[PDB]
Ligand SMILES: *[C@@H]1O[C@H](CO)[C@@H](O[C@@H]2O[C@H](CO)[C@@H](O)[C@H](O)[C@H]2NC(C)=O)[C@H](O)[C@H]1NC(C)=O
Ligand SMILES: [Ca+2]
């Protein structure tokens with residue numbers, strides 16, 4: 238196991254967003270050409286084991302631990318009836334006080350806020366990726382595709398990501414092999430060697446959230462200078478075509494920085510190898 242390895246993301250230009258937005262409210266449009274300098278990205282979502290090394294080293298108490306609760310999806314026991322703020326739900330206790338991470342050391346860390354994610358990444362000699370870096374990397378060297386691997390959800394009849402199958406939220410069939418999270422090294426890599434960049438856990442980025450984008454070409458953009466929500470990307474094991482069609486690289490959503498949930502995690506990036 239080497240679940241803190243990073244891969245080199247090459248310098249390049251890419252089309253961020255899409256002129257065929259599927260969730261227009263989220264500012265997926267307009268497509269815009271963005272130049273990204275070479276940098277490093279974590280191959281994997283940060284896992285429970287890796288986060289635990291952080292907490293062991295620093296003594297860090299996460300915001301959900303300090304608040305005393307976090308959001309859990311009802312199906313595994315609000316912004317929807319199926320989101321419940323559960324007392325004692327946190328990264329070590331992902332469905333509440335009588336759940337554990339002991340049997341899932343290699344799954345992505347959950348119930349970490351934007352601040353928690355910044356603390357970890359900076360501890361690791363790293364940082365969060367910008368939205369642009371995140372999306373460029375998600376796209377894995379392909380131009381204007383829906384998904385990291387292309388435009389078919391199940392290429393060659395194979396599942397390529399951990400999302401929802403069945404009738405959301407009543408029934409998750411587990412067709413893809415996982416109802417909740419999967420190990421961070423599950424499913425094929427994209428063309429840059431990244432795992433689970435769509436699906437599994439949502440992923441925090443550094444950017445403040447806006448839905449207002451210029452078509453202007455930009456270089457290593459950092460997003461808007463102010464805001465109230467930070468940008469998350471890539472969707473989760475809860476995502477489905479019918480309600481949360483956000484397991485696309487162009488997709489995007491947001492939460493306040495002190496937010497945490499049973500489907501939200503992160504990975505880090507770095508300018509140089511730490
Ligand atoms: C985080 O630190 C804990 C506490 O030391 C580690 O768990 C203990 O590790 C020692 C030394 O290997 C074992 O002998 C004990 O049996 C462990 N205690 C428990 C509670 O099981 C743990 O390994 C550390 N985690 C990481 C990811 O490094
Ligand atoms: Ca699944």
Ligand SMILES: [Ca+2]
Nearest residue numbers: 433434436438
């Ligand atoms: Ca993910």
